[PDB]
Amino acid sequence: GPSFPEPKVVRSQGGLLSLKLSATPTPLAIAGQRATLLTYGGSFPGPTLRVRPRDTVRLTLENRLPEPTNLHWHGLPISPKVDDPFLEIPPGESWTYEFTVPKELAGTFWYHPHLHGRVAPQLFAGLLGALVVESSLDAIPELREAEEHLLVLKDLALQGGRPAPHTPMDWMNGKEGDLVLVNGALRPTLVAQKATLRLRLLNASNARYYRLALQDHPLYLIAADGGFLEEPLEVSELLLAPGERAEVLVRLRKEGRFLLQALPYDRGAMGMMDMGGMAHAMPQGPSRPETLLYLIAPKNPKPLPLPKALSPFPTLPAPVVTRRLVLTEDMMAARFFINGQVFDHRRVDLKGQAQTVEVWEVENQGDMDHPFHLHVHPFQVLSVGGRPFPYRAWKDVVNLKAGEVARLLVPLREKGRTVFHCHIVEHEDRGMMGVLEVG
Amino acid sequence: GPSFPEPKVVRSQGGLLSLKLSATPTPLAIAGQRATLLTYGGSFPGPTLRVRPRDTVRLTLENRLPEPTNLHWHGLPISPKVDDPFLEIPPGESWTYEFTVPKELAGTFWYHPHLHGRVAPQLFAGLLGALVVESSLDAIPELREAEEHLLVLKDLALQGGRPAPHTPMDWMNGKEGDLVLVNGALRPTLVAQKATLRLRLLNASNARYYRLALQDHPLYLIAADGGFLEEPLEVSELLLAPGERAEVLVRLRKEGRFLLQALPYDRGAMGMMDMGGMAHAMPQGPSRPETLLYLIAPKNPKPLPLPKALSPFPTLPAPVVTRRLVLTEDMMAARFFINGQVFDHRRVDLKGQAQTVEVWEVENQGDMDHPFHLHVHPFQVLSVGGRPFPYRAWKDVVNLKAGEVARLLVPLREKGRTVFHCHIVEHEDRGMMGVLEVG
Ligand SMILES: [Cu+2]
């Protein structure tokens, strides 16, 4: 096959992407070993769905798992009556999701389970895939002539040929695995044929962070979770928290082999130790560095010029309300809270008005990083930790280090009941989620 | 008695104003005629209560009317568990209101009934009185040396020796009377002994407006409904809508007699006419001019200098929400609405958070003037009709002409359920009221 493994793509046909997927335990070859994973469409990752604005998606999910499941269309600004976080598909049953892709939309999105209390083991086991919304912007020569690839960043641990079970410490920290994979492959080689690469990046891990850096090269950020920036932004490294996406251009500078690494990063995970009068929690410290893939540049690379502009960011109406959401932890109990409460599906926490804009101040009063996610309503990050964000783009996950406050501009779009929660999915399962109702 | 009639004053004693009032039908002499009014304390107006910050008020209201009644402590920022708009005192029964006068408070306030559906006839019949909160500011020589008077502006109509009954047209327009009185007197004479007068003004009428102007003189506004301005403001005239208060300094310029008038003003009241194929509503147009009192200046008046400053207005925290309240009318039905609804005591319309600040945009989409009142939480008027307010001071009633939007800064103070409503009291009785809950 191609030196660089990427999930199979399924494209809409005549404006319709009609597809039946099954969620099923699947024997497969993974990183040189045989294992049984839980997959969509018989593969890990699941197939990449590629659509355009205004397309119709008709996706029938058949549940062949021994437990209930459902889908979250992560990042898509569609109705929560379709992207329904409360829906349960029992074992053996099917459900058809049908929606129209919004007209003003572009970027890399993804699908995965969202059945409260069961997300972490289901996602860890292999249930996820990407969804790409193609844009007319993709036709500008600076992008069209680039070599494009999707990189699904997901780690895994195996035990007895199956995903390793969650331990109590996993429910506290969020589970990370020793197999740090790209598109389900172990340190693949990307042999570039063009000097400019366009890479769509997805962190589909439960809890692992990727502090991305390519040896000897900067990255040019061109899209965040939910859409393009206004112009490219040069960065020396790029942190991708669980659930986040980004698109970057890479401008290969000379011939050779360059490592794409996940550099050491301390997200505040904890261990336990006993030193003589102890049995207390202790920081794990930063992750060990990982090589994600080997990038081989072509002969005499002459990269394209960068695009001068991408997509202007919408001018938003003045906000009509300010909200405060405070995140806290009870680590030893593995309980996690928003404004002092755990999730209750029957309780509405915030009531907002469709087509108004709100300011949300999300404050992390815990010691761990928490990546905060809001369904249905993409947001503009104004600042984090008192630092203004260096670009305007739509995001749907924002990472908060210990103590940091994120200020978000949140236009409320589709009416209905939806959720916001930490995207360390173990924390969501353990209570760190709330309910927003838009009317 | 004194050439200028003013209500009897009752003052706190040793930090306590403990008083038993009765609401009772009372035969009295009024404007040269014998009539039976409904009064507090056997007089019209009721007695003026004069207190200082931190005083305790203990007022036992005995209901000797044939219908239920209660008290609203208009303008006082106290608890709605005390100033309770839902409380009913049945005929023959008593209730004791007890509260502490807030420390940061000064100005002219008032008390009157607020039993939904019965306010207009009870207020029209004579049930009201003033409450003055004395301030240390009253000791500055520019105020202390002024001659002070209260002017309670209230009109009346008599029929068969009793207040005239409400007609259907009265419920639509709000009732006005032909006897336009000051402190219950018909065009009294004020023989000034000092060149500077300090006049505390109260519009305690159901619906009549007073476009105040003193012949040959400007007025110097020093306080609005709920407190002092920051410095005196010179005005050529001053409109007082129902429920509003103001305090002004008058600087008598020469010897002579000067009329204080209520100049013509069109508040949009309506009549009906039939011209040949008709039976349709027609504007009443502006009120006829009224003389309120005769002011006689002393010999060789040399008024005091004006105070250079009064009270700095508090710096308010940034607001956390913006509200929109739209007022509309169904004139022929005599029904009046806020956001398309009539009052329902069981329904909460707005829920806010104590100690936060809100912006309220109140929009009059009707054709009549409506003076909008909020209980419990005094506000700062930022602008009306797109025109910035020329001073900072606490208000609790804001007049809106047809089409105008008022923008208010509303700090939420005491917790509990309270109301906002039009202070043309017939409109309140006929539905133009809503419920605010502060938690
Ligand atoms: Cu997600």
Ligand SMILES: [Cu+2]
């Ligand atoms: Cu978390």
Ligand SMILES: [Cu+2]
């Ligand atoms: Cu979610």
Ligand SMILES: [Cu+2]
């Ligand atoms: Cu009042």
Ligand SMILES: [Cu+2]
């Ligand atoms: Cu009104």
Ligand SMILES: [Cu+2]
């Ligand atoms: Cu009221």
Ligand SMILES: [O-]
């Ligand atoms: O999610």
Ligand SMILES: [O-]
């Ligand atoms: O009132």
